[PDB]
Amino acid sequence: MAFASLIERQRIRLLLALLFGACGTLAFSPYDVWPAAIISLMGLQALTFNRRPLQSAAIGFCWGFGLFGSGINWVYVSIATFGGMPGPVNIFLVVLLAAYLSLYTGLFAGVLSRLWPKTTWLRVAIAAPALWQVTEFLRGWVLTGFPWLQFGYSQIDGPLKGLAPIMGVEAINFLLMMVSGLLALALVKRNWRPLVVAVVLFALPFPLRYIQWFTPQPEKTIQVSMVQGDIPQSLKWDEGQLLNTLKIYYNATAPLMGKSSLIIWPESAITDLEINQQPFLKALDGELRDKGSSLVTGIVDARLNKQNRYDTYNTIITLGKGAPYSYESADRYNKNHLVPFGEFVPLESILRPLAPFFDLPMSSFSRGPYIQPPLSANGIELTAAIAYEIILGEQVRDNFRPDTDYLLTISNDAWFGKSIGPWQHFQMARMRALELARPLLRSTNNGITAVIGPQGEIQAMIPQFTREVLTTNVTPTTGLTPYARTGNWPLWVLTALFGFAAVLMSLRQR
Numbered sequence: 423m424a425f426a427s428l429i430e431r432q433r434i435r436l437l438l439a440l441l442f443g444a445c446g447t448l449a450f451s452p453y454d455v456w457p458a459a460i461i462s463l464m465g466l467q468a469l470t471f472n473r474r475p476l477q478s479a480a481i482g483f484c485w486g487f488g489l490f491g492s493g494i495n496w497v498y499v500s501i502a503t504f505g506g507m508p509g510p511v512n513i514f515l516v517v518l519l520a521a522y523l524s525l526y527t528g529l530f531a532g533v534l535s536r537l538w539p540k541t542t543w544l545r546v547a548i549a550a551p552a553l554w555q556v557t558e559f560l561r562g563w564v565l566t567g568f569p570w571l572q573f574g575y576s577q578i579d580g581p582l583k584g585l586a587p588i589m590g591v592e593a594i595n596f597l598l599m600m601v602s603g604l605l606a607l608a609l610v611k612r613n614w615r616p617l618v619v620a621v622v623l624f625a626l627p628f629p630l631r632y633i634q635w636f637t638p639q640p641e642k643t644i645q646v647s648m649v650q651g652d653i654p655q656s657l658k659w660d661e662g663q664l665l666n667t668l669k670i671y672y673n674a675t676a677p678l679m680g681k682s683s684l685i686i687w688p689e690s691a692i693t694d695l696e697i698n699q700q701p702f703l704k705a706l707d708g709e710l711r712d713k714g715s716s717l718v719t720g721i722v723d724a725r726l727n728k729q730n731r732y733d734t735y736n737t738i739i740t741l742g743k744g745a746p747y748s749y750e751s752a753d754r755y756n757k758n759h760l761v762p763f764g765e766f767v768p769l770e771s772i773l774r775p776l777a778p779f780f781d782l783p784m785s786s787f788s789r790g791p792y793i794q795p796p797l798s799a800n801g802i803e804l805t806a807a808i809a810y811e812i813i814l815g816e817q818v819r820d821n822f823r824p825d826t827d828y829l830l831t832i833s834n835d836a837w838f839g840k841s842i843g844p845w846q847h848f849q850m851a852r853m854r855a856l857e858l859a860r861p862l863l864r865s866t867n868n869g870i871t872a873v874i875g876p877q878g879e880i881q882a883m884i885p886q887f888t889r890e891v892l893t894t895n896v897t898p899t900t901g902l903t904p905y906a907r908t909g910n911w912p913l914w915v916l917t918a919l920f921g922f923a924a925v926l927m928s929l930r931q932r
């Protein structure tokens with residue numbers, strides 16, 4: 423007994439917040455338990471009740487530390503495997519990353535308690551979702567952002583699936599936070615009205631999820647094929663292995679050359695500069711056009727700037743019928759949002775010589791234009807997003823065009839190894855496909871290579887960590903979703919209104 427005495431202790435709540443914070447990771451990874459997200463948000467909402475601003479900030483920081491150290495720890499695997507640093511240094515780096523990610527949850531909890539101290543429906547339903555949206559935007563914007571582990575992505579297959587195509591995964595985050603706050607308030611106050619309101623709010627989008635915003639045109643059906651080279655990441659960036667990788671990809675492509683129409687290779691499938699492999703690319707494009715196919719592969723390009731400086735762009739070249747290959751062609755995609763510490767190392771003067779982990783091969787990339795024309799191959803338009811860029815919903819939507827028939831994503835998940843990072847990335851890609859209502863053609867070296875339907879459901883998939891070829895027929899779709907039409911503008915208007923109302927009520931509370 424005496425639960426009230428123990429629960430009203432800051433030290434105990436810190437330990438209890440760690441468990442509830444880590445409980446949220448059961449919704450993104452292959453665990454895929456969407457009630458866990460609601461439970462974790464309920465814990466975060468409840469454990470900050472009746473606390474001073476500093477204690478609430480500590481509770482939020484511990485919750486974020488659990489969440490981002492129990493499901494972002496797969497970064498440590500990549501760091502240790504492909505970087506020469508001691509184990510204490512690696513664990514310090516992953517702990518520091520978790521703490522940095524948890525700062526924006528501690529800030530959320532602190533501001534929420536500072537402005538709305540008393541546990542009320544207002545705080546748990548209006549102020550909390552708006553402030554949570556603001557802090558998530560800050561986390562995804564500052565220092566190029568790391569918008570990972572957003573609970574809306576857990577609703578890719580759930581009751582709130584249909585909310586994504588209308589307003590987005592960020593609005594799904596908003597609704598999840600609101601419902602979970604109402605549930606936490608009902609649990610804390612032992613009341614039934616917040617529970618009923620939360621049930622109504624959560625069950626409202628279930629009929630909404632049946633709306634079909636896309637027309638599955640079958641007249642433009644193709645036979646896309648994707649190749650998993652299963653190239654070892656350690657040997658990926660070498661000299662002798664380049665010929666072996668090219669031979670493997672060519673031999674995998676040759677049977678498909680003639681039967682398939684949209685052969686795709688993973689990110690950085692060709693591990694050499696585009697200019698160096700010019701005759702090979704020319705011959706490959708010629709023989710692909712002879713048999714009537716296309717090859718949207720990935721390569722590394724080093725263009726010359728106006729200042730005679732070589733800028734390295736992570737690129738997606740296009741070859742075959744419907745898109746003749748040329749070094750000056752505009753039918754290419756340059757990666758815009760580079761991955762921190764892996765593609766653009768900040769402070770190269772000190773960080774790069776500090777350890778071999780910072781001085782990874784093929785680094786110091788150059789960002790491409792934010793908005794780029796869609797890739798054309800065999801008469802169809804593909805929206806490209808290299809690896810990490812897929813999770814950026816706003817950038818993907820901005821690059822999206824009404825003429826887009828497929829969403830293209832190529833990644834190299836061999837860094838993460840056997841962990842949950844590739845699965846979380848795949849889930850975020852599925853959420854993007856659901857939001858834009860376009861079929862997704864995701865190709866990976868070792869990670870999850872699959873074709874995602876317009877509703878986010880997996881149409882085809884191949885086992886992870888193998889050298890397989892995913893050959894299937896995918897039908898394009900036409901039509902603009904409300905999310906594609908608008909963006910985050912409706913969500914930002916809604917959260918601005920809610921925040922303004924909450925601030926006015928807090929000031930008027932006096």
Ligand SMILES: CCCCCCCCCCCCCCCCCCCC(=O)O[C@H](COC(=O)CCCCCCCCCCCCCC)COP(=O)(O)OCCN
Pocket residue numbers: 497500501515516518519522565567568689690761762763764765782783784785808809810833834835837
């Ligand atoms: C006030 C300062 C506070 C600082 C707070 C941060 C401190 C901690 C920072 C260190 C810990 C994070 C380290 C993450 C990078 C580890 C190395 C990963 C390598 C990598 O980036 O993958 C590349 C691209 O990723 C891909 O193409 C696919 C993977 C994309 C997902 C990557 C997820 C991990 C990155 C998370 C970084 C978050 C930083 C947020 C600040 C490989 O791609 P490639 O095959 O073409 O090889 C070409 C490579 N040269």
